[PDB]
Amino acid sequence: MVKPEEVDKAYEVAKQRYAEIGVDTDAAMKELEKVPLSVHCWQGDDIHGFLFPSGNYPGIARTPDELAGDMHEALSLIPGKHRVQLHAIYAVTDKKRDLDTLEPEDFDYWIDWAKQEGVGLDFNGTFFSHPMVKDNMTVSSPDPKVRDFWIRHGKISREISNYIGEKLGSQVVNNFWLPDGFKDNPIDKKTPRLRLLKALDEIIKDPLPEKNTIESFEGKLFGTGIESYTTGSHEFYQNYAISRNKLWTIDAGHFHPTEDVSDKFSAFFPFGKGLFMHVSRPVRWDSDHVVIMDDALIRITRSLVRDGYLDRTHIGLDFFDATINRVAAWVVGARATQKSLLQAMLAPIDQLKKDELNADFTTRLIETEELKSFPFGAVWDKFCQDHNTPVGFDWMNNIHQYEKDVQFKRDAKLVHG
Amino acid sequence: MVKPEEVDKAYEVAKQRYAEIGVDTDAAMKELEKVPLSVHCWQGDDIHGFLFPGNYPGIARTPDELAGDMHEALSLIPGKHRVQLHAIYAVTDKKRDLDTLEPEDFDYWIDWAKQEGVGLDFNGTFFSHPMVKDNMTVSSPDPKVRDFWIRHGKISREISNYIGEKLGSQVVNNFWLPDGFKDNPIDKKTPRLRLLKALDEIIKDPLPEKNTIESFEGKLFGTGIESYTTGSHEFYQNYAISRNKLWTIDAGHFHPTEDVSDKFSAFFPFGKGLFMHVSRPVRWDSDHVVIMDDALIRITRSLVRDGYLDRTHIGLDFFDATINRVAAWVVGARATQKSLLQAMLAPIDQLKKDELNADFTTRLIETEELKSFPFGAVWDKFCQDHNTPVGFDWMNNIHQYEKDVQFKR
Amino acid sequence: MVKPEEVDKAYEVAKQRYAEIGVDTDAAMKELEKVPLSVHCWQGDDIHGFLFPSGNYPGIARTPDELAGDMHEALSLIPGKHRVQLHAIYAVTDKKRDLDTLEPEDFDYWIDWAKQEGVGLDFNGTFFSHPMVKDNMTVSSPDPKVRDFWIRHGKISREISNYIGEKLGSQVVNNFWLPDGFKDNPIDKKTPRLRLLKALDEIIKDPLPEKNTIESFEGKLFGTGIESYTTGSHEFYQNYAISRNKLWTIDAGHFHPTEDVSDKFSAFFPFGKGLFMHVSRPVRWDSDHVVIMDDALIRITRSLVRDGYLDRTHIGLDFFDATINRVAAWVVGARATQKSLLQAMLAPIDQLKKDELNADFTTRLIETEELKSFPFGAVWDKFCQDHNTPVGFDWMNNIHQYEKDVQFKR
Amino acid sequence: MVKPEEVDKAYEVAKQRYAEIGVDTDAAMKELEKVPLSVHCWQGDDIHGFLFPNGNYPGIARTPDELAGDMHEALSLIPGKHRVQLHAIYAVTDKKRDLDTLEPEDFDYWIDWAKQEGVGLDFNGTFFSHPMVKDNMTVSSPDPKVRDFWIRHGKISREISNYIGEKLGSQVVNNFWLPDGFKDNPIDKKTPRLRLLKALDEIIKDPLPEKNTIESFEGKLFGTGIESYTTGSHEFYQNYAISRNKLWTIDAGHFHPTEDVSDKFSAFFPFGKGLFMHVSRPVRWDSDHVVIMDDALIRITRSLVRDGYLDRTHIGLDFFDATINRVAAWVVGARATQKSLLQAMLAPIDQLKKDELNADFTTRLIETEELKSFPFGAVWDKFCQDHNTPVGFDWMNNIHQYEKDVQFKRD
Ligand SMILES: [Mn+2]
Ligand SMILES: [Mn+2]
Ligand SMILES: [Mn+2]
Ligand SMILES: [Mn+2]
Ligand SMILES: [Mn+2]
Ligand SMILES: [Mn+2]
Ligand SMILES: [Mn+2]
Ligand SMILES: [Mn+2]
């Protein structure tokens, strides 16, 4: 167990080290406080939800109460104040429901939980794992009956999101992700994107207060069993968001091999409103690995900090690893993102910008490289301790306690509710 | 030497093979006639131009030589096409810099285009100049550098307007900027805001759309500018749509495994027009001669199947000096044409119906069979009908041009 | 229906166009009929096998007799004579078996079928979809019980292979693919590959007649749920094959983005014995799409043909698409491969090589590009007709008849 | 300026943090001392060399003395004991020489400098920038006159390397890199590689003691103007090295998009003798950017120390950036590599290995991620200070002084 006075001592030394290069470590920690991460609920129960009925880790959540407890446990090890992303299938009601019959009140459970937990809520319509998914197509299906069903869900997703936003007093980002596409090479690339354009326009048609909710649109290059064509491409959705004055969702695992998603922000913000940045680790495909401190995460976080885009960018976690402790998964990803944000915030950005404007690329290379071995860990440790979360390896103690007390017994416990 | 009667025989057999699956070979050839390729002048003289004075012999060194080489290439490319000029191909006895060019400096090319019977497209030259400061031009943080290149940009529009008025054919004025960083930048925002402001100033003075319209060409990375490109594909698609201008897709300028044929159907619900630069990247932006490969096949069939040709200008953009430079044009142009023609020789309306009905079996079988249908016999007929040599035969014309012209330089 | 006179006509015109550039179309077709393709049995029944009993196309095979009939139908529409790959889980027996208790006689069904069908057989041990797959590891597992189990199966794959080869009088290529790897970033990359080296050496220890069987070893870059580290890498297996004088398996789906597997042949053969070339279409991952005529297949086929490597290269199909008629999948993939081989064989290779030796890169570019629009289709159509298979679209009639009479009735 | 007592106090605190997770910082720094980096001479003078006399940062070296002084300055800012790589075109002689008439004594200047400086030397034959490069081919050219010329150079590279090895009493790694290939798609892939095999075998024919020199073979996926085919492929050279019992050169910039060269070590060492690891940063192609602390470098260094391959792996620098202070370029790349090696050496590797063997992938993910924010910087700073080099930003002062006193006065 780290000693709190050692953390405080190491922080004063680091603060001095940074002050000597014109960086204020107190101000950097204050900046990190103001960046809430939207923790995805579906990592807790392998995206089962509650609407419809292998070497994976024990302790999967099977009920609202279980998932809520698991997210509370994860959030108690993530320093600061954050948000939670819900999916439509996480509706809590005993009334018989389908995706086109959900009502705002079906999320009262999550509204009450979020108020008592002190987090905001983001929302995702569920356009997958349903018999109305016809040949991998939903909203942009050539079948009018299939299209009309999913348009109904899409409209309902806004109604729910508006209601949640009104009750919490915090704007709900309503994210749209559609599987729509083909496994093999299509003949017609145009007509599916025109069907999508018209169906999306119909979904966002009825006005709702922007203070309560706003829609984001999430593209993808390719998915399993849908590899050759994605109806909702990144180009289609950036165009759609700018044109219809909505948010654009950038998921870090959904782009080309070698594609740096941190390049997109400064090409979008001269034209568009806001982004939903979904941090996710792709390993040679859209594998949805837990977020770690790697090149991609470091570039995403430093690009948002350096160019001042945080107040127009929502940061969400989107990954799914059931092979490890599901609660640990959230905490690794959240801490990875926070410490990368913090490292970016501990740079003398104004002086570096100056040197770069004067084409002093020598200084820029040297300093950026020296900063990677500066004592950013001491500032991170201080941030963890100040927000009553365990430091470094110490949070494994919390995970072992949660495994003994909950996760390793859960499977044998009778589910109820 | 292929016998015309053999071409005619093969064509009649192919015509019947295609008619049996509801494809009209005569109509397919009429469709191909309507697609002019914009042949880039700079392949002729390794992008030297005329403004600022182990490769294959016979490089063009003068306007007349370059004009003669383009005439030779066009004579071996069936149908009617266009030529792309760079600003540095100005023809004048006057002392010019990129900020002092005048429209009449291109009278030479207007006259040549009229006698050759081709339209002209234009490119501002924002590279190979002392005023390129740290690989930046219009979006340079130095106002002296920015103002110089803004003057050149404005002049590129005035030149393009003048050419368009004289030819009575709209000149597409393509903007490509090297602007970016070799290594990792701190500020990605400000360069792109400087670009936005500069481009807006360049296009400020209204010019008739009947004479010219601007297109904007993004890049992922170039040599010595690998880490950041100010003018990104996203920046320019957004810029084109918002400013009601054309977007330039160069097949060589995207990510590994990136399929540029995906972009058309995501652009046209929002945008006005495309300039599609066919170019072959070999593991980087290598500007290899266009060949019949997956990329070209997908580009051409995507434009044909979704009926985007009337809104897509097709230009060649490559540079290979290791081979006969005139041959380079003909290989690239013929690859593009035969690929367009193969796409036009599909029963597209029936295939679309099969696809709407989720008959993915029929789609796979038929698209694979069409790859070995006799599309070559329709291509050969198109070549012959338009007074150009068939197959290997045009190598005779190259060897004669080498002997009589190129090898004598 | 295509008119056979039409085909014969178009062929004679093609024959002359090719003759004019020093290519013999009759000779090219003779070369093609000497290239057997190893048709994978598992496309027919979604790799279910027989050992351990939503937008999926109808008519899936459920029994040996059904799978046998489906492969007979597919082969009937593929011109020339070919081979079939079995997996261990395709054992046909009424006896209680696990992967470590399989007997050669359990493959008597397939030997009898192959002799009647007139095809050779290749083999694959089944190192997946089993409770003894522990944390995605089999032969190279750190758990000795798991190792021993999979080592027993490895040895049995060789024994079965030897028996099939003896009975058929044609060499059985016994292909080893293992899923062994880690989902996330490993600490120790060395020890797993040392465990694999030791285990493989144990599996191939007991000598078996080469005339009957030889082993091939199949690497992978990454798989679903095993993305970060593959124990059996391409580098590992090329080194293992060369050093233990075995075959190396190259699957066209299992390499890096932009990786051209046709580059590997000429870098292997100065050192190595033979290759098992598995044609498979990756679409942005190891997606096992049906093989089509694309840059990869064209480069694979022309690289084998131009450099004379066919006599040392076994060509197998490896793909799994259940979204389309499963019998059609076989025929599309096989015809695409043969088409692409034939186009390679229809080039003036000796003259092009001389042009290249003299650095005449102009002639090489012009000619290779012109050959892409030469009437190779007319020669392919002739090959199809000569070997009593339908021409072009026509074989769709056979699929519709097989759907009505057999597939749609299951 | 950093205060030595402040570095020492921060080190003692870090020592304690690492001791508590079973890591010995003092031992970790001793392990780092034993990894010499082979600093490439050609970054100093834009690969001009001296043999054939004939936008960019000022102060390029133009003479042996200027280059020697620049490498001395760079080494003075890189903590510990390292090596220098020479190219054959860095011959120092007033005699009229071609690449096929170089003599060992032509390198006496560099032997004398290395003895003075207290560093070992590695060597590279120069198979580029010469009229005898015919259609981008050298050793494996279809022209027997071209082949024979370059084979003469290849034999001479071994004779030079043996001589240097003897004089310095330190084995010279003689690295072979050939541009040989095609710009566009070849018809015949087989024959070029059979020509290469035959030519390499003739080059290494004459026996020389391993004690003085051993050959390494460097492959490439593609180069500028040689994009479509490389005769000397990675597969060809790994097979060649294992077969002929020589070293295999892995250059981090010469592989496919997304390729992780750190994967290759554990697939090589069950079969082969040794590696020459050229650290180099590719940015979307073989761009030869200065090495920085990124995923690739972190994976290369941790893969070598985790699996205990350092005693069989020579680490060399290979990059060329003339847009920045050329001496600075060396220090950035060397320090990136050392701090990355050091971080990997500061992990509880035995415990992590045990956890992994026991399939505790939860613990492995948590711990590896926590280690990335442990105070490795305080250990790095201690290593820098202990070895009489400036800490953190401080060495920018030395660069500015060297610009003022030496570099900016040259041009
Ligand atoms: Mn997402
Ligand atoms: Mn994902
Ligand atoms: Mn272009
Ligand atoms: Mn280009
Ligand atoms: Mn395979
Ligand atoms: Mn596969
Ligand atoms: Mn190197
Ligand atoms: Mn390099």
Residue numbers in the entry:
A (entry chain D): 1 to 53, 64 to 427
B (entry chain B): 1 to 53, 65 to 420
C (entry chain A): 1 to 53, 64 to 420
D (entry chain C): 1 to 54, 65 to 421
Study authors write:
Four crystal structures, such as LrL-RhI alone and complexes with L-rhamnose (LrL-RhI/L-rhamnose), D-allulose (LrL-RhI/D-allulose), and D-allose (LrL-RhI/D-allose), were determined at resolutions of 1.90, 1.61, 1.73, and 1.71 Å, respectively. The structural metal (Mn1) is coordinated by Glu228, Asp261, His288, and Asp328, and the catalytic metal (Mn2) is coordinated by His264, Asp296, Asp298, and three water molecules (W4, W5, and W6). The bound metal ions with strong electron density maps were refined as Mn2+ since LrL-RhI was expressed in cells in a medium containing 1 mM MnCl2. A part of the flexible loop region (Asp46-Thr73) was almost missing in the structures of LrL-RhI alone (missing Asn54-Ser64) and complexes with L-rhamnose (missing Pro53-Ser64) and D-allose (missing Asn54-Gly65) due to the weak electron density maps, but the corresponding region in the structure of LrL-RhI/D-allulose (Mol-A and Mol-B) was relatively visible, and a part of the region (Asn54-Gly65) was refined with 50% occupancy.
